[PDB]
Ligand binder design. Sequence first.
Ligand SMILES: CC(C)(COP(=O)(O)OP(=O)(O)OC[C@H]1O[C@@H](n2cnc3c(N)ncnc32)[C@H](O)[C@@H]1OP(=O)(O)O)[C@@H](O)C(=O)NCCC(=O)NCCS
Ligand SMILES: CC(C)(COP(=O)(O)OP(=O)(O)OC[C@H]1O[C@@H](n2cnc3c(N)ncnc32)[C@H](O)[C@@H]1OP(=O)(O)O)[C@@H](O)C(=O)NCCC(=O)NCCS
Ligand SMILES: *[C@@H]1O[C@H](CO)[C@@H](O[C@@H]2O[C@H](CO)[C@@H](O)[C@H](O)[C@H]2NC(C)=O)[C@H](O)[C@H]1NC(C)=O
Ligand SMILES: *[C@@H]1O[C@H](CO)[C@@H](O[C@@H]2O[C@H](CO)[C@@H](O)[C@H](O)[C@H]2NC(C)=O)[C@H](O)[C@H]1NC(C)=O
Ligand SMILES: *[C@@H]1O[C@H](CO)[C@@H](O[C@@H]2O[C@H](CO)[C@@H](O)[C@H](O)[C@H]2NC(C)=O)[C@H](O)[C@H]1NC(C)=O
Ligand SMILES: *[C@@H]1O[C@H](CO)[C@@H](O[C@@H]2O[C@H](CO)[C@@H](O)[C@H](O)[C@H]2NC(C)=O)[C@H](O)[C@H]1NC(C)=O
Ligand SMILES: CC(C)CCC[C@@H](C)[C@H]1CC[C@H]2[C@@H]3CC=C4C[C@@H](O)CC[C@]4(C)[C@H]3CC[C@]12C
Ligand SMILES: CC(C)CCC[C@@H](C)[C@H]1CC[C@H]2[C@@H]3CC=C4C[C@@H](O)CC[C@]4(C)[C@H]3CC[C@]12C
Ligand SMILES: CC(C)CCC[C@@H](C)[C@H]1CC[C@H]2[C@@H]3CC=C4C[C@@H](O)CC[C@]4(C)[C@H]3CC[C@]12C
Ligand SMILES: CC(C)CCC[C@@H](C)[C@H]1CC[C@H]2[C@@H]3CC=C4C[C@@H](O)CC[C@]4(C)[C@H]3CC[C@]12C
Ligand SMILES: CCCCCCCCCCCCCCCC
Ligand SMILES: CCCCCCCCCCCCCCCC
Ligand SMILES: *[C@@H]1O[C@H](CO)[C@@H](O)[C@H](O)[C@H]1NC(C)=O
Ligand SMILES: *[C@@H]1O[C@H](CO)[C@@H](O)[C@H](O)[C@H]1NC(C)=O
Ligand SMILES: CCCCCCCCCCCCCC
Ligand SMILES: CCCCCCCCCCCCCC
Ligand SMILES: CCCCCCCCCCCCCC
Ligand SMILES: CCCCCCCCCCCCCC
Ligand SMILES: CCCCCCCCCCCCCC
Ligand SMILES: CCCCCCCCCCCCCC
Ligand SMILES: CCCCCCCCCCCCCC
Ligand SMILES: CCCCCCCCCCCCCC
Ligand SMILES: CCCCCCCCCCCCCC
Ligand SMILES: CCCCCCCCCCCCCC
Ligand SMILES: CCCCCCCCCCCCCC
Ligand SMILES: CCCCCCCCCCCC
Ligand SMILES: CCCCCCCCCCCC
Ligand SMILES: CCCCCCCCCCCC
Ligand SMILES: CCCCCCCCCCCC
Ligand SMILES: CCCCCCCC
Ligand SMILES: CCCCCCCC
Ligand SMILES: CCCCCCCC
Ligand SMILES: CCCCCCCC
Lengths: 533, 533
Amino acid sequence: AELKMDQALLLIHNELLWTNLTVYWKSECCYHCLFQVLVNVPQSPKAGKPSAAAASVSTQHGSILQLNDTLEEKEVCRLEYRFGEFGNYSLLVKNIHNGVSEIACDLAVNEDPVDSNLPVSIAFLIGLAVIIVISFLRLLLPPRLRSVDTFRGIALILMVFVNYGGGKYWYFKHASWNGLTVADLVFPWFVFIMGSSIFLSMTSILQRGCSKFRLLGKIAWRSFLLICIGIIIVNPNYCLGPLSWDKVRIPGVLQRLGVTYFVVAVLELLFAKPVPECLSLRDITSSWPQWLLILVLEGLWLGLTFLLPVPGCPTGYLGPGGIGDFGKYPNCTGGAAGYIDRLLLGDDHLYQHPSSAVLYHTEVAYDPEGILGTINSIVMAFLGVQAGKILLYYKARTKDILIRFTAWCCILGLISVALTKVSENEGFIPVNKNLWSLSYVTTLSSFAFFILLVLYPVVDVKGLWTGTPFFYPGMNSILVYVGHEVFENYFPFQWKLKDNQSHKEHLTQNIVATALWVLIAYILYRKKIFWKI
Amino acid sequence: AELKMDQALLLIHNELLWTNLTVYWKSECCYHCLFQVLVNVPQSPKAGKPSAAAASVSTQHGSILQLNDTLEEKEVCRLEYRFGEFGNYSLLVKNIHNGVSEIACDLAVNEDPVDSNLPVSIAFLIGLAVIIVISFLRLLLPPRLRSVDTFRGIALILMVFVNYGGGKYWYFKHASWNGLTVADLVFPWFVFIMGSSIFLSMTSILQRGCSKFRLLGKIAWRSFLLICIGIIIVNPNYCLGPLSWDKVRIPGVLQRLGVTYFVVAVLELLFAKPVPECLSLRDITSSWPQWLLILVLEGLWLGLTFLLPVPGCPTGYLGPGGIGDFGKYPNCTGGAAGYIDRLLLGDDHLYQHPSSAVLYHTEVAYDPEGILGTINSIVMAFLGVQAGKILLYYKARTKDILIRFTAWCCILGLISVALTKVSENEGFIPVNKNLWSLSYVTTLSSFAFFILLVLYPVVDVKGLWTGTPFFYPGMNSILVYVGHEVFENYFPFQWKLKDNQSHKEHLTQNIVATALWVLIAYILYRKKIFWKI
Ligand SMILES: CC(C)(COP(=O)(O)OP(=O)(O)OC[C@H]1O[C@@H](n2cnc3c(N)ncnc32)[C@H](O)[C@@H]1OP(=O)(O)O)[C@@H](O)C(=O)NCCC(=O)NCCS
Ligand SMILES: CC(C)(COP(=O)(O)OP(=O)(O)OC[C@H]1O[C@@H](n2cnc3c(N)ncnc32)[C@H](O)[C@@H]1OP(=O)(O)O)[C@@H](O)C(=O)NCCC(=O)NCCS
Ligand SMILES: *[C@@H]1O[C@H](CO)[C@@H](O[C@@H]2O[C@H](CO)[C@@H](O)[C@H](O)[C@H]2NC(C)=O)[C@H](O)[C@H]1NC(C)=O
Ligand SMILES: *[C@@H]1O[C@H](CO)[C@@H](O[C@@H]2O[C@H](CO)[C@@H](O)[C@H](O)[C@H]2NC(C)=O)[C@H](O)[C@H]1NC(C)=O
Ligand SMILES: *[C@@H]1O[C@H](CO)[C@@H](O[C@@H]2O[C@H](CO)[C@@H](O)[C@H](O)[C@H]2NC(C)=O)[C@H](O)[C@H]1NC(C)=O
Ligand SMILES: *[C@@H]1O[C@H](CO)[C@@H](O[C@@H]2O[C@H](CO)[C@@H](O)[C@H](O)[C@H]2NC(C)=O)[C@H](O)[C@H]1NC(C)=O
Ligand SMILES: CC(C)CCC[C@@H](C)[C@H]1CC[C@H]2[C@@H]3CC=C4C[C@@H](O)CC[C@]4(C)[C@H]3CC[C@]12C
Ligand SMILES: CC(C)CCC[C@@H](C)[C@H]1CC[C@H]2[C@@H]3CC=C4C[C@@H](O)CC[C@]4(C)[C@H]3CC[C@]12C
Ligand SMILES: CC(C)CCC[C@@H](C)[C@H]1CC[C@H]2[C@@H]3CC=C4C[C@@H](O)CC[C@]4(C)[C@H]3CC[C@]12C
Ligand SMILES: CC(C)CCC[C@@H](C)[C@H]1CC[C@H]2[C@@H]3CC=C4C[C@@H](O)CC[C@]4(C)[C@H]3CC[C@]12C
Ligand SMILES: CCCCCCCCCCCCCCCC
Ligand SMILES: CCCCCCCCCCCCCCCC
Ligand SMILES: *[C@@H]1O[C@H](CO)[C@@H](O)[C@H](O)[C@H]1NC(C)=O
Ligand SMILES: *[C@@H]1O[C@H](CO)[C@@H](O)[C@H](O)[C@H]1NC(C)=O
Ligand SMILES: CCCCCCCCCCCCCC
Ligand SMILES: CCCCCCCCCCCCCC
Ligand SMILES: CCCCCCCCCCCCCC
Ligand SMILES: CCCCCCCCCCCCCC
Ligand SMILES: CCCCCCCCCCCCCC
Ligand SMILES: CCCCCCCCCCCCCC
Ligand SMILES: CCCCCCCCCCCCCC
Ligand SMILES: CCCCCCCCCCCCCC
Ligand SMILES: CCCCCCCCCCCCCC
Ligand SMILES: CCCCCCCCCCCCCC
Ligand SMILES: CCCCCCCCCCCCCC
Ligand SMILES: CCCCCCCCCCCC
Ligand SMILES: CCCCCCCCCCCC
Ligand SMILES: CCCCCCCCCCCC
Ligand SMILES: CCCCCCCCCCCC
Ligand SMILES: CCCCCCCC
Ligand SMILES: CCCCCCCC
Ligand SMILES: CCCCCCCC
Ligand SMILES: CCCCCCCC
C-alpha cells in the first residue's frame, strides 16, 4: 504494497461535529512554497463515530501539516513532524471540553517506522572492514601524474554510483534547486580535472616542438567528437523510439565539456609560454591575458543573470518557479538562463525532466547544461588550469606546491562563504548546480584544491598509496562514461528486483554495478587498452 | 492511412436477396491451411440496393477467396487473385438471370495498385551504375586467405541488411516454415566459414609447435565467451525492462556458434594430423574418424526427427502446426525438435516469436536455434572444415582445388535435389531453416562450395579483385555483429520515418545503415583495430 518507498501512512480522525477539515502539506526542504492539499476529511456524522481519512506523507524530510476549516477557511491547528518510512501514524482532531471550546489535534504512532539509512551504514561498515582487512593482511606480508588519475577515478566511481540510482536515497541524488548533495560534486570536478589536463598535455606537446596549428586541429577535432557523441549517443533515449529532430535535446554533459575544452584550450594555446625554472607569483603573473578575459566572462555572467530583463518575470530571478516563492512565478524556472535557453533553442530541445519538477512542481522545461552556465564551466576549467600550472611551475619543490594549493583553497572557500552566507537558500548567490552559479564553482573548486592538497603528497611524492582502485577508472574515463550510458539497462548492471520499494535492494544493485565498472577498467588497464578522444 | 503496407482494399457488394455471404481468405503460400473468415456480408435489403462490406487483403502472395452461403454452409463462388498493394478492388456478387438461377461473382479494379518492387529495382540499378562508374574511372587511371574474408564480409553485409528490416519485403525476411528467402542464407554460411577457419587456424598453430592442451584451453575459453555474450548481450530486449530469469531465452545464434565451435574444434584437435605434400583422396581418407562420428550424429538426428514419439502429436511431424495441415495439429510446431526444446528448457526459455506465427498463426513458442538442430549445425561446420582441408592439402595446385570444390558442390546439390524433390513443401526432407533440416544444410553448403569456387581464383590466385568492400567487414565480424545488435535503434542507423507504410523509406534507411556499418569496418581496418573472440 500500500505504501511506496520513503512514505508513511497518516490516518486522520475528525471528532468535530460541525467542521469540515482540509489538510495541507508542505515539506521543510521546499523553500517559500505553497501548501498543497493532502486529504479532505469530512465532519463526524455522530458523536463517538469520528470520520476517518487516510493519506501518504513523504518521509524524506520534515513535514508541515495545516488543518483548515473548509467552510470558514480558518486554521484549526498546525503540526510539524518528521514521519518515518513505512510508519503508521494516526492524527486525532477533537475539541477539548475541559472548560474551553478549542480544538487540540495530537499525533500518535500506531506502528513504528523502519530505519531507512541502515543499509547505508552497513555498507560503509562492510567497506571499511574490507579496507582494514586488506591493509593488515598485505602489511603482514613527462610521466603521468598518479594523483590526477586517482582524482578522476574517484569522480568516475561516484558518477557511476549516483547515475545508476544511488540506492534511491535523496542525498545520493541531485538537489531540487539549491544546495549540495553527493550527486552535485562530480561534474565540476571533471571540468576542473579536464582543465588541469589541458595545461599538462599542451605544455608537454609544445616543449617537444609541435606546431600550434597542428595542436589547434587536435583541439578542434576533440571538441567536435565530444559534442557529437553527446548529442547522438548519450542524450537520446532510444528505448522510446527512433530519433526525431523536433525532440532532440541539444545541450548535455559532453556538449558542455566540448565547448569548455575548446574555449579553454584555445585560450591557453594563444598565450602559451614556456615553463621557467618561494615568493614568486609567476604562475599567475605570466598569464594575465587569460585572467583578464576570464574576469570579463564572469562579469558577463553576472550582468546577464542579475540585470537582463525577462518578459513577464522578475529581473534577477534565481528561484525555481512552480510552487516555489509562494507560486508567484510558476513559469520562471531558471530566470535569465532558462529564458536564453528557451529563446535560442526552444523548449523542445531542452531537458524535459529538471530536478526541480518533483519538489517545486515546475512544468516548464529547463536544461541544467544550458548556454549561460557555460561561462561558469569555463571559469571552473580555468581554475583547473591554474592547478596544473602550480604542478609544473614548482615541480621541483613540494613545499611550494602545497602552499599554493592551500592558499587557493582558502581564497575560494572565503569567496564561497561570502556569496552563500553559509546557507542553502539565503545569500547573494546560493549554490545551484542547475544555474552553475558562481558560488557553486568557487565551492567545488575549493574542494578540488583541498583534494589535490591531500592526494599529491600521499600518492605522488611520498608514495604511501598507489591510488588503487581509482586510477584504473581514471585512465579510461571516456570508456567508462560512454559505457555506463550505453549498457545501463544490461545485466549484470541491472536485474529484476524482488521489491522495488526497498532501499536495501536498490543499494546492493548499484554497489555491485559500480564495482563491476571498476573491474572492467582494471581489466582494460591490464591489457593496456586506453582510449582518448 | 486506411491501408497498411502490402494490403489492398476489397469491397464486396451482395446483390442476392435471400443469402447471407461469408467470405473466407487463404494465401497461396500457406500450405494445406484452413480458410479464415475475411468479412461477413449481409443480404441485400431491397433490389437495386446491394449490401456493401469492406476488407483488407494481403498482397504479398496470391489470394484465394471462398464465398459461402452462411445459412446453408454451401459454396457460392471461388476466386483466385493476386491483389496489388494499395489497390482498390470491388467484388460484385449477383445472380445472373439470363435463363439461369446461378450466381456469378466477378472482380473489378476501381483504382490501380502501385509497383511494390520498384524501389528494389531502382536500388539495384543505382548500385550497378555506381559499380560501372567506379570500374571505368579507375581503369582510365601463413597469410590470410582473402577469399574467405570476402565471403564472410558478403554474409555480414547481407545479415546487417536483413536484420535491420530488409526494406520490409517478404523475400528479404525469413520464410514462414519451408523454403528459402535471402534472409535464410547467411547463418549457415557463417557456420561453414567458421569450420574452414577452425581448420586453417588449428593447422597453423600446431605446425608452430603449440601443445594440444593450450589449444584446448583456447577452444574452451572462446566457446564460453560466445555462449555468454549470446545469452547476456544479444538475446535480451532491455528496452522492455530489467532481466528476469523466468523469461531468459537460453538458445540463440552465438550459443549455437559456441557449441558447434567447441564440438568441431575438439573433434579436429583429437585427430589432428600434419598436412603432407591429382587422383588423391587423402583429405577425406586421413580424417575417417571424423566422418564416422559425423555420420553417427546425422543418424541420430534422422532417428529423433522421424521416429521419436511426441505425446499427442504425430511421429515424424515436420509441419508448423497452427492452421497449417488443415489445423489438425495446432500445438505441434516443430515436431520432435520443439518437443525436446520444451521438455528440456521449457516454453519460457525459448523464442517467443517464431517466423511461422504470422502465416500459420502458431501459438506455441518455438526456437529456431534449438537443441536438435545443433547436430546439423555441426554437420555444416564440418563441411566447412573439408573446404579448409582442400585449401591446404592442395595449396600448390589451383587445378586440384577447383576440381575438389566442383565435385563437392555437385554431390551436395544432387543430395539436395533428391531430398527436396525440387519443391518447397514436398519431398522427404523439405528445406527448413527453423528445423535446420538436412536438405537445408546440403543446399546451403552446395552454395558455399560454389561461392568458394568462384572467389578463390578471382580473388586469391589471379588477383583480379581484392574483395572490396567486403573483406573490411569480413575481418571484424564479431565487432560488426555485436555492434549492430547493440546500436540497432541508434541514429544514424534508424530515424523517424515520414511514412511507416512505405517500402521506399524503409529500404533507403536499411541501405544507409548497411553502408554505415561497412564504413565503420573500413575505418577499423585502416587503424588496424581487430577483435577476435
Ligand atoms: C571527457 C573526459 C574524458 C575528459 O578527459 P580529461 O580529463 O581531459 O582526460 P583525458 O584522458 O582526455 O586526457 C587528455 C590529455 O591529458 C593528459 N593527461 C590526462 N591525465 C593525466 C595525468 N594524470 N597526468 C598527466 N597527464 C594527463 C593525457 O596524456 C592526454 O594528453 P595527450 O592528448 O597528449 O595524450 C572525462 O572528463 C569524462 O569522461 N567526462 C565525463 C563527464 C561526467 O561524467 N560528468 C558528470 C555527469 S555524468
Ligand atoms: C562468430 C564469428 C566471429 C565466427 O568467426 P570465424 O568465422 O571463426 O572467424 P574468426 O575471425 O573468429 O577467426 C578465428 C581464427 O581463424 C583465422 N582466420 C579467420 N579468417 C581467416 C582467413 N580468411 N584466412 C585465414 N585464416 C583466417 C584467424 O586467424 C583466427 O585464428 P587465430 O585464433 O589463430 O588468430 C562470426 O561467424 C560471427 O560474427 N557470427 C555471426 C553469426 C551470424 O551473424 N549469423 C546470422 C544470424 S544474425
Ligand atoms: C488556512 O487558513 C489560514 C487562516 O488562518 C490562511 O492564512 C491566511 O491566508 C490568506 C490567503 O488566502 C492570507 O491573506 C492571510 O494573511 C492568512 N492569514 C494568516 C493568519 O496566516 C491559510 O492561507 C489557509 N491555508 C491555505 C493552504 O490556504
Ligand atoms: C495502522 O494502524 C492501525 C491501528 O490503529 C490499524 O488499524 C487496525 O487494523 C486492525 C486490522 O485490520 C484492526 O483489527 C484494528 O481494529 C484496527 N484499529 C483501528 C484503531 O482502526 C491499521 O490497519 C494500520 N494500517 C496498516 C496499513 O497497517
Ligand atoms: C464452404 O462450403 C463448402 C461446401 O461447398 C465447404 O466444403 C465442405 O466442407 C466440409 C467441412 O465442414 C467437408 O466435410 C466437405 O467435404 C466439403 N465439401 C466440399 C465439396 O468441399 C467448405 O468447408 C466451406 N468453407 C469453410 C471455410 O468452411
Ligand atoms: C475505392 O473506389 C471506389 C470506387 O468504386 C470509391 O467509391 C467512390 O468514392 C467517391 C468519393 O467518396 C464517391 O464520390 C463515389 O460515388 C464512390 N463510388 C462508389 C461506386 O461507391 C472508394 O471511395 C474508393 N476507396 C478508397 C479508400 O479510395
Ligand atoms: C562587456 C561584457 C562582455 C561584460 C559586461 C556586460 C554587462 C555590463 C552588460 C551585459 C547585459 C547588460 C544589461 C542587459 C539589459 C539591460 C536592460 C536595460 O533596461 C538597461 C541596461 C541593462 C541592465 C544592461 C546593462 C549592462 C549589462 C549588464
Ligand atoms: C605503506 C604504508 C606506510 C601504508 C600506507 C597507508 C595508506 C594505505 C593510507 C595512509 C594515508 C591514507 C590516505 C589519507 C587520506 C585520504 C583521504 C581521501 O582523500 C582519500 C583516501 C586517502 C588518500 C587515504 C588513502 C589510504 C592512505 C594512503
Ligand atoms: C546410436 C545413435 C547415436 C544413432 C542412431 C539412433 C537411432 C537408431 C535411435 C534414436 C532414437 C530411437 C527411437 C526412439 C524411440 C522409439 C519409439 C519406440 O516405440 C520404438 C523405438 C524408437 C522408434 C527408437 C528407435 C531407434 C532410434 C531411432
Ligand atoms: C584488373 C582488371 C582485369 C579488372 C578486373 C575486373 C573485376 C573488378 C571483376 C571481373 C570478374 C568479377 C567477379 C566475377 C564474379 C563474381 C560474382 C559474385 O560471386 C561476387 C562478385 C564477383 C566475384 C565479381 C566481382 C568483380 C570482378 C572481380
Ligand atoms: C560508492 C560505490 C562503491 C563501489 C565500490 C567500488 C570499489 C571496489 C572495486 C572492486 C574491483 C577491484 C579491482 C582492482 C583489483 C586490484
Ligand atoms: C544490400 C545492402 C547494400 C549496402 C551497400 C554497402 C556497400 C557500400 C559500402 C560503402 C562504404 C565504402 C567503404 C570502403 C571504401 C574503399
Ligand atoms: C462538509 O462537506 C459535505 C460534502 O458535500 C457537505 O455536504 C457538508 O455540508 C459539509 N459540512 C459543512 C459543515 O460545511
Ligand atoms: C442474415 O443475417 C442477419 C443477421 O442477424 C439475420 O437477421 C438474417 O435473418 C440473415 N438472413 C438469412 C437469409 O439467413
Ligand atoms: C548547503 C550548504 C552550502 C555550504 C557551502 C560550502 C560552505 C563552506 C565553504 C568551503 C570551505 C572550504 C573547505 C575545504
Ligand atoms: C604556429 C605559429 C603561431 C601561429 C598562431 C597560432 C594561433 C592558434 C589559435 C588561434 C585560432 C583561434 C580560432 C578560433
Ligand atoms: C585536423 C582536424 C580538424 C577538424 C575540425 C573540426 C571542426 C569542428 C570544430 C568544433 C568546435 C566546437 C566548439 C565550439
Ligand atoms: C604544420 C601543419 C599544419 C596543419 C594545419 C591544421 C589546421 C587545422 C585548423 C582547424 C581550425 C578549426 C576551427 C574551428
Ligand atoms: C546533506 C549532504 C551532505 C554532503 C554534502 C556534500 C558536501 C560535503 C562532501 C564533499 C567534501 C569533498 C572533500 C572536500
Ligand atoms: C616536504 C613536504 C613533504 C610532504 C608533507 C605533506 C604534509 C601536508 C599534508 C596536507 C594534508 C592536510 C590534511 C588535513
Ligand atoms: C524453395 C525451393 C528450394 C530449392 C532447393 C535448391 C535446389 C537446387 C539444389 C542446388 C543446386 C546447386 C547449384 C549451385
Ligand atoms: C599434448 C599431448 C596430447 C594430449 C591429447 C590432447 C587431447 C585434447 C582433446 C581431448 C579433450 C576432450 C574434452 C571434452
Ligand atoms: C584456459 C581457459 C579455460 C577456460 C575454460 C572455460 C570452461 C567453459 C567451457 C565451455 C564449453 C561450451 C561448449 C559446450
Ligand atoms: C602446457 C600448458 C598446459 C595448459 C593447460 C590448460 C588446460 C585447459 C583445459 C580446459 C578444459 C575445459 C573443458 C570444458
Ligand atoms: C524467391 C526467393 C529467391 C531467392 C532464393 C535464394 C536462392 C538463390 C540465391 C542464392 C544463391 C547463392 C549463390 C549460389
Ligand atoms: C550532430 C547533429 C546530429 C543531429 C541529429 C538529427 C536527427 C534527425 C532525425 C530525422 C527525423 C526527423
Ligand atoms: C538475483 C540476481 C543476482 C545477480 C548478481 C549479479 C552478479 C554479477 C557478476 C556476474 C558477471 C557476469
Ligand atoms: C550466463 C548465464 C547468465 C544468466 C542470467 C540470469 C539473469 C537472472 C536475473 C535475476 C532476476 C530474477
Ligand atoms: C531525415 C533524416 C536523414 C538522416 C540521414 C542519415 C545520414 C547518416 C550520415 C551521418 C553519420 C553521422
Ligand atoms: C561496500 C562498498 C563500499 C561502501 C559503499 C557505501 C555506499 C553508501
Ligand atoms: C565576494 C564578495 C561578495 C559580495 C557580498 C554580498 C553580500 C550580500
Ligand atoms: C544502392 C546499394 C546497392 C544495391 C542494394 C539493393 C537492395 C535491394
Ligand atoms: C539421398 C537419398 C534420399 C532418399 C530419397 C527419398 C525419396 C522420397
